[PDB]
Design an enzyme around this catalytic site. Structure first.
Site, PDB file in Angstrom:
ATOM      1  N   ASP A 106       5.408  -7.327  27.764  1.00  0.00           N
ATOM      2  CA  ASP A 106       6.663  -7.684  28.426  1.00  0.00           C
ATOM      3  C   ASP A 106       6.421  -8.830  29.409  1.00  0.00           C
ATOM      4  OD1 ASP A 106       9.172  -7.744  29.618  1.00  0.00           O
ATOM      5  OD2 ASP A 106       9.166  -5.653  30.308  1.00  0.00           O
ATOM      6  N   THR A 107       6.719 -10.050  28.975  1.00  0.00           N
ATOM      7  CA  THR A 107       6.560 -11.198  29.847  1.00  0.00           C
ATOM      8  C   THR A 107       7.572 -11.190  31.001  1.00  0.00           C
ATOM      9  OG1 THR A 107       8.015 -12.560  28.418  1.00  0.00           O
ATOM     10  CG2 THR A 107       5.625 -12.652  28.030  1.00  0.00           C
ATOM     11  N   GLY A 108       8.601 -10.344  30.897  1.00  0.00           N
ATOM     12  CA  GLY A 108       9.549 -10.152  31.982  1.00  0.00           C
ATOM     13  C   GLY A 108       9.182  -9.052  32.968  1.00  0.00           C
TER      14      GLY A 108
END
Length: 99
Positions: A25-27
């Site tokens: 999850d780059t967020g």
């Protein structure tokens, strides 16, 4: 490895000697793993998502293998619906976004 995004980027990780599935999850600033009696001491933290906050246990210097790549750092434990690998560990394995 290259991971396409047609489907959720789920991979195998190892933490506390246990194998789990987790979402890359780059967020996510931080790594959040499902209820697991991780040894060691922990401390409380609240983390926010799209609808509000949950309470988690912050553990430091925890070894975590991600797709065979060793990492070590902070892991938040709590009642997350999905195990999440966040940027704190993604950076350690040299993960980038490319387009």
């Amino acid at each position: 490895p290259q991971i396409t995004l047609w489907k959720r980027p789920l991979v195998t990780i190892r933490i506390g000697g246990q194998l789990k599935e987790a979402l890359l999850d780059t967020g996510a600033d931080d790594t959040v793993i499902e209820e697991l009696n991780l040894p060691g001491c922990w401390k409380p933290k609240l983390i926010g998502g799209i609808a509000g906050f949950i309470k988690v246990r912050q553990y430091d210097q925890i070894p975590v293998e991600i797709a065979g790549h060793k990492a070590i750092g902070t892991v938040l434990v709590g009642p997350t619906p999905v195990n999440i690998i966040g940027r704190n560990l993604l950076t350690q394995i040299g993960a980038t976004l490319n387009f």
